[PDB]
Design a protein around this nucleic acid. Sequence first.
RNA 1: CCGAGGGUAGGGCCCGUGACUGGGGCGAAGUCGUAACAAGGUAGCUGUACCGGAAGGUGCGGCUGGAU
RNA 2: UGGGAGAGGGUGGUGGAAUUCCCGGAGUAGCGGUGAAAUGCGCAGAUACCGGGAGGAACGCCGAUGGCGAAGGCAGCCACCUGGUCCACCCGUGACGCUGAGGCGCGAAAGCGUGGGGAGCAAACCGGAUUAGAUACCCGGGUAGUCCACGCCCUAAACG
RNA 3: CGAUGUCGGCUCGUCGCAUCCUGGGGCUGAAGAAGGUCCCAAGGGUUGGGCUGUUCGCCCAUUAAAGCGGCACGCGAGCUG
RNA 4: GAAUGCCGGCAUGAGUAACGAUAAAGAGGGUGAGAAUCCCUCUCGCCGUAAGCCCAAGGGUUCCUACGCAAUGGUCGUCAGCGUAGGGUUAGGCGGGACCUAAGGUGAAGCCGAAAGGCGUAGCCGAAGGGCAGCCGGUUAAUAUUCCGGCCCUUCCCGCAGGUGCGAUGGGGGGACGCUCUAGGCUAGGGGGACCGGAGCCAUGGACGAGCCCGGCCAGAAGCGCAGGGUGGGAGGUAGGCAAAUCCGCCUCCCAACAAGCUCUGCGUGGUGGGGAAGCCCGGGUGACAACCCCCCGAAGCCAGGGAGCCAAGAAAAGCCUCUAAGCACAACCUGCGGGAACCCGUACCGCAAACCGACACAGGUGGGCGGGUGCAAGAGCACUCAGGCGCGCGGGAGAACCCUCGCCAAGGAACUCUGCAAGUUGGCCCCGUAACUUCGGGAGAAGGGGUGCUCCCUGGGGUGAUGAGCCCCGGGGAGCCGCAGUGAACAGGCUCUGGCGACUGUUUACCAAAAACACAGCUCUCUGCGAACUCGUAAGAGGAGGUAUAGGGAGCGACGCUUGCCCGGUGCCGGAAGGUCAAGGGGAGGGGUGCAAGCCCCGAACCGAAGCCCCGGUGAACGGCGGCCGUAACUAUAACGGUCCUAAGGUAGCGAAAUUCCUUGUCGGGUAAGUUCCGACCUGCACGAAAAGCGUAACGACCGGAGCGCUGUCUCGGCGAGGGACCCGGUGAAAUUGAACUGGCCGUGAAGAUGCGGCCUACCCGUGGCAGGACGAAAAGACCCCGUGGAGCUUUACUGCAGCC
RNA 5: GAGCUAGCCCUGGCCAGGGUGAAGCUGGGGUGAGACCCAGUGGAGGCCCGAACCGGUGGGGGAUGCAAACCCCUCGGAUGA
Lengths: 48, 275
Amino acid sequence: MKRTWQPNRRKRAKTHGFRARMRTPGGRKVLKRRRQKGRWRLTPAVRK
Amino acid sequence: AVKKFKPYTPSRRFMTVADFSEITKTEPEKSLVKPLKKTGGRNNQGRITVRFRGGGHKRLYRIIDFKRWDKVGIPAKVAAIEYDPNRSARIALLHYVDGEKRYIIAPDGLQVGQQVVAGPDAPIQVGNALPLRFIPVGTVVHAVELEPKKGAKLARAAGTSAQIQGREGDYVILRLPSGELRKVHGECYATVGAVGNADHKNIVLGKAGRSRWLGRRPHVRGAAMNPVDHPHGGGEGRAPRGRPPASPWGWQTKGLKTRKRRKPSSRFIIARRKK
RNA sequence: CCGAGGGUAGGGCCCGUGACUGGGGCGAAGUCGUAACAAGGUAGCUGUACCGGAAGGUGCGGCUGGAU
RNA sequence: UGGGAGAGGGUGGUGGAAUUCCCGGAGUAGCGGUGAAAUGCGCAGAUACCGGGAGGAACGCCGAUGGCGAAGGCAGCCACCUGGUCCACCCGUGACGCUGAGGCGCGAAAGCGUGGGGAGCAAACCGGAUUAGAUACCCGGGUAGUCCACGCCCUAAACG
RNA sequence: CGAUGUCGGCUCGUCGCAUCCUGGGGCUGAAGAAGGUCCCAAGGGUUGGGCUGUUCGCCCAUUAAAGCGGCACGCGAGCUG
RNA sequence: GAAUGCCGGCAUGAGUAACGAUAAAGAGGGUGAGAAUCCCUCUCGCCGUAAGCCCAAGGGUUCCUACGCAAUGGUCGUCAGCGUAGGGUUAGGCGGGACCUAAGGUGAAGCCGAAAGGCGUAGCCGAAGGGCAGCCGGUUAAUAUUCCGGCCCUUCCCGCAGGUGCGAUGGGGGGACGCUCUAGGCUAGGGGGACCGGAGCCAUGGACGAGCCCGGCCAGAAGCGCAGGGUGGGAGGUAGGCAAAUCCGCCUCCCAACAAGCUCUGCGUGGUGGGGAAGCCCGGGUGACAACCCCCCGAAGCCAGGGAGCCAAGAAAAGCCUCUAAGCACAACCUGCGGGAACCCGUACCGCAAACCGACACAGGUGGGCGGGUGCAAGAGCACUCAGGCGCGCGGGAGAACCCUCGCCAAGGAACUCUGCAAGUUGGCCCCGUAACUUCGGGAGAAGGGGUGCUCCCUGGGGUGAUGAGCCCCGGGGAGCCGCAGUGAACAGGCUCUGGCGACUGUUUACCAAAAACACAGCUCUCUGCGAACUCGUAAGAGGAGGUAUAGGGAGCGACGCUUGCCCGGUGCCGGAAGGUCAAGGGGAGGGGUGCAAGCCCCGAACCGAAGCCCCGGUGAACGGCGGCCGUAACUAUAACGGUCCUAAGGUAGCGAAAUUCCUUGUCGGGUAAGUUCCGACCUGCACGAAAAGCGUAACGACCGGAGCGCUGUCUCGGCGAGGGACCCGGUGAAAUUGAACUGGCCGUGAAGAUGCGGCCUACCCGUGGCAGGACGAAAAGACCCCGUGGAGCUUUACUGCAGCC
RNA sequence: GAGCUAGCCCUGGCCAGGGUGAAGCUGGGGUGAGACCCAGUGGAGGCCCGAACCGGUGGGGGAUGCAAACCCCUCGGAUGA
Ligand SMILES: CC[C@H]1OC(=O)[C@H](C)[C@@H](O[C@H]2C[C@@](C)(OC)[C@@H](O)[C@H](C)O2)[C@H](C)[C@@H](O[C@@H]2O[C@H](C)C[C@H](N(C)C)[C@H]2O)[C@](C)(O)C[C@@H](C)CN(C)[C@H](C)[C@@H](O)[C@]1(C)O
Ligand SMILES: [Mg+2]
Ligand SMILES: [Mg+2]
Ligand SMILES: [Mg+2]
Ligand SMILES: [Mg+2]
Ligand SMILES: [Mg+2]
Ligand SMILES: [Mg+2]
Ligand SMILES: [Mg+2]
Ligand SMILES: [Mg+2]
Ligand SMILES: [Mg+2]
Ligand SMILES: [Mg+2]
Ligand SMILES: [Mg+2]
Ligand SMILES: [Mg+2]
Ligand SMILES: [Mg+2]
Ligand SMILES: [Mg+2]
Ligand SMILES: [Mg+2]
Ligand SMILES: [Mg+2]
Ligand SMILES: [Mg+2]
Ligand SMILES: [Mg+2]
Ligand SMILES: [Mg+2]
Ligand SMILES: [Mg+2]
Ligand SMILES: [Mg+2]
Ligand SMILES: [Mg+2]
Ligand SMILES: [Mg+2]
Ligand SMILES: [Mg+2]
Ligand SMILES: [Mg+2]
Ligand SMILES: [Mg+2]
Ligand SMILES: [Mg+2]
Ligand SMILES: [Mg+2]
Ligand SMILES: [Mg+2]
Ligand SMILES: [Mg+2]
Ligand SMILES: [Mg+2]
Ligand SMILES: [Mg+2]
Ligand SMILES: [Mg+2]
Ligand SMILES: [Mg+2]
Ligand SMILES: [Mg+2]
Ligand SMILES: [Mg+2]
Ligand SMILES: [Mg+2]
Ligand SMILES: [Mg+2]
Ligand SMILES: [Mg+2]
Ligand SMILES: [Mg+2]
Ligand SMILES: [Mg+2]
Ligand SMILES: [Mg+2]
Ligand SMILES: [Mg+2]
Ligand SMILES: [Mg+2]
Ligand SMILES: [Mg+2]
Ligand SMILES: [Mg+2]
Ligand SMILES: [Mg+2]
Ligand SMILES: [Mg+2]
Ligand SMILES: [Mg+2]
Ligand SMILES: [Mg+2]
Ligand SMILES: [Mg+2]
Ligand SMILES: [Mg+2]
Ligand SMILES: [Mg+2]
Ligand SMILES: [Mg+2]
Ligand SMILES: [Mg+2]
Ligand SMILES: [Mg+2]
Ligand SMILES: [Mg+2]
Ligand SMILES: [Mg+2]
Ligand SMILES: [Mg+2]
Ligand SMILES: [Mg+2]
Ligand SMILES: [Mg+2]
Ligand SMILES: [Mg+2]
Ligand SMILES: [Mg+2]
Ligand SMILES: [Mg+2]
Ligand SMILES: [Mg+2]
Ligand SMILES: [Mg+2]
Ligand SMILES: [Mg+2]
Ligand SMILES: [Mg+2]
Ligand SMILES: [Mg+2]
Ligand SMILES: [Mg+2]
Ligand SMILES: [Mg+2]
Ligand SMILES: [Mg+2]
Ligand SMILES: [Mg+2]
Ligand SMILES: [Mg+2]
Ligand SMILES: [Mg+2]
Ligand SMILES: [Mg+2]
Ligand SMILES: [Mg+2]
Ligand SMILES: [Mg+2]
Ligand SMILES: [Mg+2]
Ligand SMILES: [Mg+2]
Ligand SMILES: [Mg+2]
Ligand SMILES: [Mg+2]
Ligand SMILES: [Mg+2]
Ligand SMILES: [Mg+2]
Ligand SMILES: [Mg+2]
Ligand SMILES: [Mg+2]
Ligand SMILES: [Mg+2]
Ligand SMILES: [Mg+2]
Ligand SMILES: [Mg+2]
Ligand SMILES: [Mg+2]
Ligand SMILES: [Mg+2]
Ligand SMILES: [Mg+2]
Ligand SMILES: [Mg+2]
Ligand SMILES: [Mg+2]
Ligand SMILES: [Mg+2]
Ligand SMILES: [Mg+2]
Ligand SMILES: [Mg+2]
Ligand SMILES: [Mg+2]
Ligand SMILES: [Mg+2]
Ligand SMILES: [Mg+2]
Ligand SMILES: [Mg+2]
Ligand SMILES: [Mg+2]
Ligand SMILES: [Mg+2]
Ligand SMILES: [Mg+2]
Ligand SMILES: [Mg+2]
Ligand SMILES: [Mg+2]
Ligand SMILES: [Mg+2]
Ligand SMILES: [Mg+2]
Ligand SMILES: [Mg+2]
Ligand SMILES: [Mg+2]
Ligand SMILES: [Mg+2]
Ligand SMILES: [Mg+2]
Ligand SMILES: [Mg+2]
Ligand SMILES: [Mg+2]
Ligand SMILES: [Mg+2]
Ligand SMILES: [Mg+2]
Ligand SMILES: [Mg+2]
Ligand SMILES: [Mg+2]
Ligand SMILES: [Mg+2]
Ligand SMILES: [Mg+2]
Ligand SMILES: [Mg+2]
Ligand SMILES: [Mg+2]
Ligand SMILES: [Mg+2]
Ligand SMILES: [Mg+2]
Ligand SMILES: [Mg+2]
Ligand SMILES: [Mg+2]
Ligand SMILES: [Mg+2]
Ligand SMILES: [Mg+2]
Ligand SMILES: [Mg+2]
Ligand SMILES: [Mg+2]
Ligand SMILES: [Mg+2]
Ligand SMILES: [Mg+2]
Ligand SMILES: [Mg+2]
Ligand SMILES: [Mg+2]
Ligand SMILES: [Mg+2]
Ligand SMILES: [Mg+2]
Ligand SMILES: [Mg+2]
Ligand SMILES: [Mg+2]
Ligand SMILES: [Mg+2]
Ligand SMILES: [Mg+2]
Ligand SMILES: [Mg+2]
Ligand SMILES: [Mg+2]
Ligand SMILES: [Mg+2]
Ligand SMILES: [Mg+2]
Ligand SMILES: [Mg+2]
Ligand SMILES: [Mg+2]
Ligand SMILES: [Mg+2]
Ligand SMILES: [Mg+2]
Ligand SMILES: [Mg+2]
Ligand SMILES: [Mg+2]
Ligand SMILES: [Mg+2]
Ligand SMILES: [Mg+2]
Ligand SMILES: [Mg+2]
Ligand SMILES: [Mg+2]
Ligand SMILES: [Mg+2]
Ligand SMILES: [Mg+2]
Ligand SMILES: [Mg+2]
Ligand SMILES: [Mg+2]
Ligand SMILES: [Mg+2]
Ligand SMILES: [Mg+2]
Ligand SMILES: [Mg+2]
Ligand SMILES: [Mg+2]
Ligand SMILES: [Mg+2]
Ligand SMILES: [Mg+2]
Ligand SMILES: [Mg+2]
Ligand SMILES: [Mg+2]
Ligand SMILES: [Mg+2]
Ligand SMILES: [Mg+2]
Ligand SMILES: [Mg+2]
Ligand SMILES: [Mg+2]
Ligand SMILES: [Mg+2]
Ligand SMILES: [Mg+2]
Ligand SMILES: [Mg+2]
Ligand SMILES: [Mg+2]
Ligand SMILES: [Mg+2]
Ligand SMILES: [Mg+2]
Ligand SMILES: [Mg+2]
Ligand SMILES: [Mg+2]
Ligand SMILES: [Mg+2]
Ligand SMILES: [Mg+2]
Ligand SMILES: [Mg+2]
Ligand SMILES: [Mg+2]
Ligand SMILES: [Mg+2]
Ligand SMILES: [Mg+2]
Ligand SMILES: [Mg+2]
Ligand SMILES: [Mg+2]
Ligand SMILES: [Mg+2]
Ligand SMILES: [Mg+2]
Ligand SMILES: [Mg+2]
Ligand SMILES: [Mg+2]
Ligand SMILES: [Mg+2]
Ligand SMILES: [Mg+2]
Ligand SMILES: [Mg+2]
Ligand SMILES: [Mg+2]
Ligand SMILES: [Mg+2]
Ligand SMILES: [Mg+2]
Ligand SMILES: [Mg+2]
Ligand SMILES: [Mg+2]
Ligand SMILES: [Mg+2]
Ligand SMILES: [Mg+2]
Ligand SMILES: [Mg+2]
Ligand SMILES: [Mg+2]
Ligand SMILES: [Mg+2]
Ligand SMILES: [Mg+2]
Ligand SMILES: [Mg+2]
Ligand SMILES: [Mg+2]
Ligand SMILES: [Mg+2]
Ligand SMILES: [Mg+2]
Ligand SMILES: [Mg+2]
Ligand SMILES: [Mg+2]
Ligand SMILES: [Mg+2]
Ligand SMILES: [Mg+2]
Ligand SMILES: [Mg+2]
Ligand SMILES: [Mg+2]
Ligand SMILES: [Mg+2]
Ligand SMILES: [Mg+2]
Ligand SMILES: [Mg+2]
Ligand SMILES: [Mg+2]
Ligand SMILES: [Mg+2]
Ligand SMILES: [Mg+2]
Ligand SMILES: [Mg+2]
Ligand SMILES: [Mg+2]
Ligand SMILES: [Mg+2]
Ligand SMILES: [Mg+2]
Ligand SMILES: [Mg+2]
Ligand SMILES: [Mg+2]
Ligand SMILES: [Mg+2]
Ligand SMILES: [Mg+2]
Ligand SMILES: [Mg+2]
Ligand SMILES: [Mg+2]
Ligand SMILES: [Mg+2]
Ligand SMILES: [Mg+2]
Ligand SMILES: [Mg+2]
Ligand SMILES: [Mg+2]
Ligand SMILES: [Mg+2]
Ligand SMILES: [Mg+2]
Ligand SMILES: [Mg+2]
Ligand SMILES: [Mg+2]
Ligand SMILES: [Mg+2]
Ligand SMILES: [Mg+2]
Ligand SMILES: [Mg+2]
Ligand SMILES: [Mg+2]
Ligand SMILES: [Mg+2]
Ligand SMILES: [Mg+2]
Ligand SMILES: [Mg+2]
Ligand SMILES: [Mg+2]
Ligand SMILES: [Mg+2]
Ligand SMILES: [Mg+2]
Ligand SMILES: [Mg+2]
């Protein structure tokens, strides 16, 4: 039956992407925290 | 006249349609339509603020001339009577000798071919608009402004009208469609006659699908819900109201008056609606 | 082939009968009241409508086959 | 052909008196109602009086023992549309007539349907009386209805 | 109570005997035939239907008889629900 | 040494279950160390509205070739979507961008918010919508509308020639639209051909044939032809389209008008370029100088922005055309032609799946297009089958119990059971025929029956031709033939009578409930006069609504028919300028502290002082409520009648042992041999009753009752048969659980149900197939129940606050 | 966090074939004119039968599954809310 992950690159980039994070106090805190933890990726990679 | 159907389906037994007899043109004037942005009842936050709206037939908005003092003295010929999905009244396309075209809401008795005009000097005949103080006492009128130059606000639905009942100073006393008796400024414009399509109120929708075509989603009773939803929610099996009948928000809904008490317009309202 | 009739199925008419129920007639030796006949104690009657234990009442309209 | 009388019918208009309600004034100790009363209304200012407004229904005098209509039935006034009928002339047609089972139409009031309208009145209903009781008669309230449009119903002491 | 699954039905039995039948008896208000009552006896047997979830019970038609109890009101790592 | 402790390692269950659709395999040849599993050939089976083909998501090298087999692959492996390496994706025209707007998002101006931020007309962004120029064939191991070949086309720049008042982000036109039905003419696609081309074939009894088998086209500028779409022409007036206007709008006049004209698209043809089968031979060669024609069927596609009808009344913006303004008129633009210029990104492969979403090479999920033929009335249904693709990544045997899926059954025929649960029966089409009741539609496929194949003969109407033959579609009549049986296989209602509930079609607890629940047209109450009420938001702003009382919000009721009684004392709501109570504030009699004092400071009575509450009324489709006792009639029984207590008033009409009735299987009647259910009655209604509506109601229902007919393995009552498992051998190889175990019965005992204690009985050691009585068997720190001064949801005339409103 | 699910907004797409035969229209009948009746034409509908598609009614299987909701048979809607 239809499951919960139905990938869609436009949706991924527009929802979790770098620019979406930057537009928002909470989103910039996500970038700040992931940079502080030393994450290799700050944002999901989507092909485009 | 309203048109009935033979009961060749369960819903056609009661369904009735407008007869559309007054309609002489089946397409809107292209220069006078704009897209009507459907809302679903949602405001600019995305939130439902009026329940049970959405999913009605697509519509174009016809631009209506609710001013008419816009063009004092310039007669126009009644070119067509058209259907307007955004209102119960029919609309009338006017061709001004100007060459300008405009819609007004179609009064009862309006005839395609005849001429109408607006202004203090206009004849007192169906379709003409005058400031209120130049229309004889006793005349029934529609498309009435509430304050000067702000637009026709009163008596706009199918078959409605207001009657002039007297004068007093700068104001004239109207009996509104609701039966209320109200002062309206004499410089307010009105159009002599009653709004047409008076058979509108005898339409029997016939089935649930018809409300859906109109954008009306199913309304659900408080009694059919749960306490988290509605004052009337819950109870085991069916329940009576068990408290003064209330809205989804708790305010009482069987008599509780709700017009604001210190409202400035109260100085101009003579008698609250009857009935 | 037709064919008495038998069989299957579905209809129509009539008769008898049925838990229970509607009123009717007669009986009269009872209970309630007294609607009509006198102006019958609210003139009567009447079609209809709503009502009342009951006869009845009231409304609307009609008739005189109503006393004074 | 030429005349007449008439609440004959249908539609649109329109006038005045009265009742009720609302507003302003003025005014106060009751008003109302009955055989007599009480309910009711009234100092939260009623009734009675003056002024203004709204609204529905019915048309006083003329009016009669009158007129018209096939019957039901029709009454302020104006206009329009329309029916029946009487008289005079004795001009036209030439028995073209009488009746009429079925049919079709009309058909008071009440009642019904869908809208409207709602002053007065008033079934149902509530109360006060009356009374032995009083699901009545009388009194104070009161909803349908009474009024308009359209569609039904098709009854009568629809009687001379 | 860090779980001992419950009514009734079905299936599968096994046991007790305070015995429903069949076998053996005494007493009888036992003529006979048929019964009544008690004693011995558990070897085997103890029907099919209508109603109701029912156990039970009532009823229809039979029968030699249409027994009553126990087994976690036997039996859901056997079924039903 | 224990914490159902934590991390790791390793056991047990066990060579056990399983190895993932029952579409299916067999043999020969080859390769290799090794072959059921890789390659090749023949045979067999399966899909074929797909299990074939193409595109979009998503995936991201999985593509091709070489060399490999440790691991991955449910076995094997020489093979692979696996390991290593090399190669492979080519565009002005395909898609997206250098174009347009949609919702929405963002946002100059502006508005709002403690901050962060929220909004916001323009503008901008935003596409699978609008707009825009490429078809066919060939080529590679792997790309191709991209390379190549042929024939076409678009834009930009510059130039030349002709023409024109040129010029825009401004004005206008256009772009520009629904649903259902549908005409004419085409094309896609298909069927047939005794005609055209072709390697061959004559088998096994016949056939050298009008034989069999195979193919008989694709693209194509201009021109032309057929069919369609779009579009009136001229003049005069002009105050409107926020400037201007010759344009557009309006008025008038003349001509033209279902003609034409002009314009555009489709289809045909068309110089020219290609393609080209079976079979044979080792993807290619040959067939071949291939032929490339006639007839028929025919779209849902095209002409297209076609036509009609209908109500629910059906985007925008740019490209485009036209108008003029600044300007500029040696320019600029328009047309023709020529030369030049023409960027960025994607392009492999999978793509109903072993490459996407499901932890897996997972029987599940995934949007668009093509989807052949014959037959069955039609069809995308069903059976077979083409092209194409597969046999599902463990096998070999055996022929038990049992399980699954399937076939049949004597006699009976619901006796099964909670229930005909399940399974039978019925089954398409044509004809005949069809009841109560009804809202006149229906009920209705009612029910019930008859026909159904093939052969010959005669014939009817339509389509295409031509008006005929031929082809094709729908038929009809007569006479015959065969079988058990003719929709001969596959797909395809069992029916009827009668109650309950809900009017109806719909909706719902994703994953235990599809219902009588929700919704629904419709009915009523109520709020709301517009900067509406109401809703979201602190606000601004929004929705309501670009609506205006025939409208919008809230509530109940729930098609329709006939109806909807009485109680307003309590609560609610509505009305009430009186009166009572009433806070801040006003007032300031009087009193107090202090100072030598003027003074400063404090307390404070009358009186004035809102909403609210009290009080007076109204109000039920507002919350709600709707009695008891005693007596009385020619026998009894009962009580129309009377009396009396209480109440705000004492349940009306209708219905009633009911989706409600405790006693209860009430009683009576019906049906049955027998009826706790069912239907019809009665009424002492424990505890119906009138919009939490009352009583009915045709039609409807995968709802829930009761009965009958048909028919059956449901049953008496079981039997046989089939395949997939189970069993045996080879390969691979889990799991929960597990204190350790050398783990029998009885009767006792024991914390009260003992393999483990006592007595006695019984018992050689170890397995395999089976069955489930026990190990108070496994699983889940009982959901019930209680306890905890544990939690959470919900209610209210609990408390106390807050928002909101006054 | 609305790539699942619920509702709405914008823009696209899909629904084989068969059946029933409303209004209207035309003709005829009828009447003073009508209503109306009959036939033909017509093609309406939360109409009917049934695929795709959307569901999930009853039963069976599955139950350390093919699957943390699947499979077979049956069944509901299928121009509309
Ligand atoms: C169908 C598959 C399921 O298996 C079931 O459904 C069983 C039939 C179920 O049984 C079903 C059906 C039924 C009728 O069982 C008696 C019902 O009462 C219970 C609640 O669930 C069991 C017996 C229940 O276990 C019972 O839990 C009861 C509360 C008490 C009872 N007691 C006897 C101890 C005990 O057996 C249980 C609690 O569900 C099991 C629990 C340990 C684990 N579950 C959560 C699992 C995940 C199940 O969902 C399941 C394995 O997927
Ligand atoms: Mg999706
Ligand atoms: Mg992904
Ligand atoms: Mg995407
Ligand atoms: Mg995308
Ligand atoms: Mg997206
Ligand atoms: Mg982003
Ligand atoms: Mg990481
Ligand atoms: Mg790094
Ligand atoms: Mg991130
Ligand atoms: Mg109708
Ligand atoms: Mg109709
Ligand atoms: Mg009609
Ligand atoms: Mg109906
Ligand atoms: Mg109409
Ligand atoms: Mg109209
Ligand atoms: Mg009209
Ligand atoms: Mg349109
Ligand atoms: Mg708009
Ligand atoms: Mg809007
Ligand atoms: Mg917004
Ligand atoms: Mg937002
Ligand atoms: Mg709302
Ligand atoms: Mg809404
Ligand atoms: Mg309109
Ligand atoms: Mg209307
Ligand atoms: Mg209505
Ligand atoms: Mg609408
Ligand atoms: Mg509504
Ligand atoms: Mg509702
Ligand atoms: Mg609920
Ligand atoms: Mg909530
Ligand atoms: Mg709450
Ligand atoms: Mg609440
Ligand atoms: Mg409640
Ligand atoms: Mg309750
Ligand atoms: Mg409830
Ligand atoms: Mg409930
Ligand atoms: Mg209850
Ligand atoms: Mg409820
Ligand atoms: Mg309910
Ligand atoms: Mg309650
Ligand atoms: Mg209630
Ligand atoms: Mg209550
Ligand atoms: Mg105002
Ligand atoms: Mg015989
Ligand atoms: Mg008397
Ligand atoms: Mg009398
Ligand atoms: Mg009575
Ligand atoms: Mg009485
Ligand atoms: Mg009375
Ligand atoms: Mg009379
Ligand atoms: Mg007399
Ligand atoms: Mg006073
Ligand atoms: Mg008089
Ligand atoms: Mg003469
Ligand atoms: Mg009458
Ligand atoms: Mg009446
Ligand atoms: Mg009395
Ligand atoms: Mg009445
Ligand atoms: Mg009435
Ligand atoms: Mg008389
Ligand atoms: Mg316990
Ligand atoms: Mg445990
Ligand atoms: Mg346990
Ligand atoms: Mg004897
Ligand atoms: Mg003895
Ligand atoms: Mg024995
Ligand atoms: Mg024994
Ligand atoms: Mg019992
Ligand atoms: Mg008994
Ligand atoms: Mg015997
Ligand atoms: Mg015996
Ligand atoms: Mg026992
Ligand atoms: Mg016990
Ligand atoms: Mg017990
Ligand atoms: Mg048991
Ligand atoms: Mg069990
Ligand atoms: Mg059990
Ligand atoms: Mg056990
Ligand atoms: Mg059972
Ligand atoms: Mg220890
Ligand atoms: Mg553990
Ligand atoms: Mg453990
Ligand atoms: Mg541990
Ligand atoms: Mg651990
Ligand atoms: Mg070990
Ligand atoms: Mg084992
Ligand atoms: Mg095992
Ligand atoms: Mg497995
Ligand atoms: Mg199978
Ligand atoms: Mg091998
Ligand atoms: Mg090998
Ligand atoms: Mg091979
Ligand atoms: Mg991946
Ligand atoms: Mg490739
Ligand atoms: Mg390997
Ligand atoms: Mg290997
Ligand atoms: Mg492996
Ligand atoms: Mg695997
Ligand atoms: Mg090798
Ligand atoms: Mg592989
Ligand atoms: Mg290479
Ligand atoms: Mg190219
Ligand atoms: Mg560029
Ligand atoms: Mg695009
Ligand atoms: Mg081309
Ligand atoms: Mg390539
Ligand atoms: Mg438009
Ligand atoms: Mg569009
Ligand atoms: Mg549609
Ligand atoms: Mg064909
Ligand atoms: Mg042509
Ligand atoms: Mg001009
Ligand atoms: Mg070739
Ligand atoms: Mg050659
Ligand atoms: Mg089609
Ligand atoms: Mg409409
Ligand atoms: Mg726009
Ligand atoms: Mg200039
Ligand atoms: Mg030019
Ligand atoms: Mg560039
Ligand atoms: Mg690139
Ligand atoms: Mg490519
Ligand atoms: Mg699939
Ligand atoms: Mg992958
Ligand atoms: Mg999974
Ligand atoms: Mg997941
Ligand atoms: Mg596999
Ligand atoms: Mg798969
Ligand atoms: Mg094809
Ligand atoms: Mg067939
Ligand atoms: Mg067929
Ligand atoms: Mg099928
Ligand atoms: Mg084939
Ligand atoms: Mg296989
Ligand atoms: Mg074996
Ligand atoms: Mg048999
Ligand atoms: Mg039978
Ligand atoms: Mg039988
Ligand atoms: Mg049953
Ligand atoms: Mg069949
Ligand atoms: Mg019948
Ligand atoms: Mg009928
Ligand atoms: Mg019907
Ligand atoms: Mg039949
Ligand atoms: Mg029937
Ligand atoms: Mg044959
Ligand atoms: Mg056969
Ligand atoms: Mg088949
Ligand atoms: Mg069928
Ligand atoms: Mg029936
Ligand atoms: Mg019942
Ligand atoms: Mg009912
Ligand atoms: Mg229903
Ligand atoms: Mg329901
Ligand atoms: Mg009903
Ligand atoms: Mg309903
Ligand atoms: Mg429904
Ligand atoms: Mg439906
Ligand atoms: Mg569920
Ligand atoms: Mg659930
Ligand atoms: Mg769940
Ligand atoms: Mg779950
Ligand atoms: Mg759930
Ligand atoms: Mg289920
Ligand atoms: Mg459910
Ligand atoms: Mg259902
Ligand atoms: Mg409901
Ligand atoms: Mg109703
Ligand atoms: Mg709020
Ligand atoms: Mg705003
Ligand atoms: Mg707004
Ligand atoms: Mg707006
Ligand atoms: Mg509105
Ligand atoms: Mg409902
Ligand atoms: Mg009826
Ligand atoms: Mg009463
Ligand atoms: Mg009350
Ligand atoms: Mg009250
Ligand atoms: Mg209360
Ligand atoms: Mg002192
Ligand atoms: Mg009422
Ligand atoms: Mg109370
Ligand atoms: Mg109530
Ligand atoms: Mg007595
Ligand atoms: Mg009662
Ligand atoms: Mg009863
Ligand atoms: Mg009942
Ligand atoms: Mg009850
Ligand atoms: Mg009880
Ligand atoms: Mg009972
Ligand atoms: Mg009981
Ligand atoms: Mg009984
Ligand atoms: Mg039963
Ligand atoms: Mg039952
Ligand atoms: Mg009784
Ligand atoms: Mg309720
Ligand atoms: Mg109820
Ligand atoms: Mg019914
Ligand atoms: Mg159902
Ligand atoms: Mg069997
Ligand atoms: Mg067999
Ligand atoms: Mg077998
Ligand atoms: Mg087998
Ligand atoms: Mg076998
Ligand atoms: Mg062996
Ligand atoms: Mg040991
Ligand atoms: Mg024990
Ligand atoms: Mg023990
Ligand atoms: Mg023991
Ligand atoms: Mg032992
Ligand atoms: Mg020991
Ligand atoms: Mg010891
Ligand atoms: Mg021992
Ligand atoms: Mg022993
Ligand atoms: Mg051993
Ligand atoms: Mg065991
Ligand atoms: Mg067991
Ligand atoms: Mg043990
Ligand atoms: Mg055990
Ligand atoms: Mg156990
Ligand atoms: Mg715990
Ligand atoms: Mg515990
Ligand atoms: Mg517990
Ligand atoms: Mg637990
Ligand atoms: Mg406890
Ligand atoms: Mg405590
Ligand atoms: Mg404690
Ligand atoms: Mg506590
Ligand atoms: Mg709490
Ligand atoms: Mg409020
Ligand atoms: Mg978020
Ligand atoms: Mg979503
Ligand atoms: Mg769209
Ligand atoms: Mg469809
Ligand atoms: Mg027809
Ligand atoms: Mg028409
Ligand atoms: Mg349908
Ligand atoms: Mg259907
Ligand atoms: Mg299912
Ligand atoms: Mg079944
Ligand atoms: Mg089965
Ligand atoms: Mg499960
Ligand atoms: Mg399945
Ligand atoms: Mg299936
Ligand atoms: Mg089916
Ligand atoms: Mg269907
Ligand atoms: Mg269909
Ligand atoms: Mg439908």
